[PDB]
Write a protein that binds this ligand. Structure first.
Ligand code: HEM
Ligand SMILES: OC(Cn1cncn1)(Cn1cncn1)c1ccc(F)cc1F
Length: 528
């Protein structure tokens, strides 16, 4: 008889509940540890699942090693398992597909298979505001991107270039980090200067003179507050009721309120031209179904676009300065190009002349290769996905992770990948180009194939639309840097390792360089 055994289950249960709370919590801690270990061993026996990276701590998973050094994590996993593997990340299962076929599998995934907004809305929506980017169906995002692109034309860039140039010179003249009329040499932290230069140039051109003017006041602190809400922390804790979450929410309201004030002021004055992105969205933000974006949604879209372009661009210009700091040969080569294209500096820089500066553009291109701002891009898996030429199935509820920035740094696709070499792009200085067929998801024709090992701007429906603005901004900025200054490292200093813990792969600061005026007695005009 096992009825007696059934009695002892009950008895055993009663004795369990009567254990000392020392052993009890000890069991509360050890019982999931064992189950988690057991479950993994069972999981590895499945062959319709990609290999899963082993981990000791339940829920946490490989979060530590991935959070701190994701490319080293990927390389070890790649050696062990190949290009497709999964790992647990703070409650989630992430399936990584490394390499060009991984680019295809994720970036060109069917709309019904994966969702970007399901992965990102929790973070971005509190920062940008409601109704836009990832707080809306994909079809709305497609048209929002179309609206923004309408202010990102060649004719717009022709107008932006002198505005951006003005801001760079103003910064050289007025910022305490330079003061070129008073000082001929100095030391700067590029992680201090580049965010400032980036927001000043982007505000002036995209938002206009009024909004740029606000950055000279205490209002600028709000952008810094809003900046704090844009952090990997908010992927896990999007809202816990403490301080920087409040200042974030406050900043969003305060900043969007300022934009709406200008929007409403321009319309009631009929003061709507073709100056900036605000004018453009005011004249062009009606969806195809006839629903118009509200002034709040327009304001929120402005925040998201400026914020995203802020962090990517500021990281890159910082990396460009840092790589050139130990390459006076490259500075010299870029300077000669400036002298030739701008006729010894007597030609005023224009958007057209920027396109005649291949080495400068190649420098941006090579920096984008070595320092892709976003080391990982996510999608939540919505339907079971079969991985082609495998028996692998990625079940709904998983997340897929694609990492073009990892491939950027592989010798197989870029010889001597860890060497900064702008000449690997000789006769290939364009920001990007489709090697064949195109397709339109609602914001213009783009590459249908996403198999390039070089994808600084992603691909597919979620592809970047700011690439030409970024090159314009970076180009003007670096053209002026090169013509005005020489710079180098403090003794014993070199290019710093990336900080993979922030939203973008910015350099580990403080990252200091020493600048010197090429023309010590050159003065920058204007009142101050
Ligand atoms: C060096 C500068 C930049 C780089 C490397 C970069 C990179 C990227 C990448 C990789 C994506 C794809 C994201 C994904 O697939 O989840 C993306 C998307 C996007 N970016 Fe950029 N970006 C840059 C600058 C900018 C600028 C200046 C703007 C706007 C003025 C901008 C606006 C956008 C927008 C609207 C998307 C669409 C996201 C989506 O559809 O889900 N970016 N960018
Ligand atoms: O793709 C981002 C969001 N993101 C994803 N991983 C980290 N941040 C970044 N970004 C890309 N280009 C510029 N910023 C984005 C996309 C659109 C957008 F409006 C804001 C925004 F942050």
């Amino acid at each position: 008889i096992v009825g007696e055994a059934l009695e002892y289950v009950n008895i055993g249960l009663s004795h369990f509940l009567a254990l000392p709370l020392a052993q009890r919590i000890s069991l509360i801690i050890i019982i999931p540890f064992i189950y988690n270990i057991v479950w993994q061993l069972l999981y590895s026996l499945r062959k319709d699942r990609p290999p899963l990276v082993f981990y000791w701590i339940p829920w946490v998973g490989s979060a530590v090693v991935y959070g701190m050094k994701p490319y080293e994590f990927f390389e070890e996993c790649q050696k062990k398992y190949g290009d497709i593997f999964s790992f647990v990340l703070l409650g989630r299962v992430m399936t990584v597909y490394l390499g060009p076929k991984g680019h295809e599998f994720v970036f060109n995934a069917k709309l019904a298979d994966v969702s970007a907004e399901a992965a990102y809305a929790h973070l971005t929506t509190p920062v940008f505001g409601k109704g836009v980017i990832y707080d809306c169906p994909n079809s709305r995002l497609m048209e929002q991107k179309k609206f923004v692109k309408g202010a990102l034309t060649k004719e717009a860039f022709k107008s932006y270039v002198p505005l951006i140039a003005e801001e760079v010179y103003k910064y050289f003249r007025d910022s305490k980090n330079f003061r070129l009329n008073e000082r001929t040499t100095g030391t700067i932290d590029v992680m201090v200067t580049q965010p400032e230069m980036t927001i000043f140039t982007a505000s002036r051109s995209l938002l206009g003179k009024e909004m740029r003017a606000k950055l000279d006041t205490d209002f600028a602190y709000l952008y810094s507050d809003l900046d704090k809400g844009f952090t990997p922390i908010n992927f896990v804790f999007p809202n816990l009721p403490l301080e920087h979450y409040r200042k974030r929410d406050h900043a969003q309201k305060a900043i969007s309120g300022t934009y709406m004030s200008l929007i409403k002021e321009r319309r009631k004055n009929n003061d709507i031209q073709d100056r900036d992105l605000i004018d453009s969205l005011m004249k062009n933000s009606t969806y195809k179904d006839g629903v118009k974006m509200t002034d709040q949604e327009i304001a929120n879209l402005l925040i998201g676009v400026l914020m995203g372009g802020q962090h990517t661009s500021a990281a890159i210009s910082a990396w460009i300065l840092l790589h050139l700091a130990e390459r006076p040969d490259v500075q010299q080569e870029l300077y000669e190009e400036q002298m030739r294209v701008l006729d010894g500096g007597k030609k005023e820089l224009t958007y057209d002349l920027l396109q005649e500066m291949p080495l400068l553009n190649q420098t941006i291109k090579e920096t984008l290769r070595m320092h892709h701002p976003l080391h990982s891009l996510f999608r939540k898996v919505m339907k079971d996905m079969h991985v082609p030429n495998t028996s692998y199935v990625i079940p709904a509820g998983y997340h897929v992770l694609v990492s073009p920035g990892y491939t950027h740094l592989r010798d197989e696709y870029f010889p001597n990948a860890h060497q900064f070499n702008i000449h690997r792009w000789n006769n290939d200085s364009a920001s990007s180009y489709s090697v064949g067929e195109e397709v339109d998801y609602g914001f213009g024709a783009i590459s249908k194939g996403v198999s390039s090992p070089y994808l600084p701007f992603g691909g597919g429906r979620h592809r970047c639309i700011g690439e030409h603005f970024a090159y314009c901004q970076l180009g003007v900025l670096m053209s002026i840097f090169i013509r005005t200054l020489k710079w180098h490292y403090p003794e014993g200093k070199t290019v710093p390792p990336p900080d993979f813990t922030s939203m973008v792969t910015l350099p580990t600061g403080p990252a200091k360089i020493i600048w010197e005026k090429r023309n010590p007695e050159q003065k920058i005009g204007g009142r101050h």
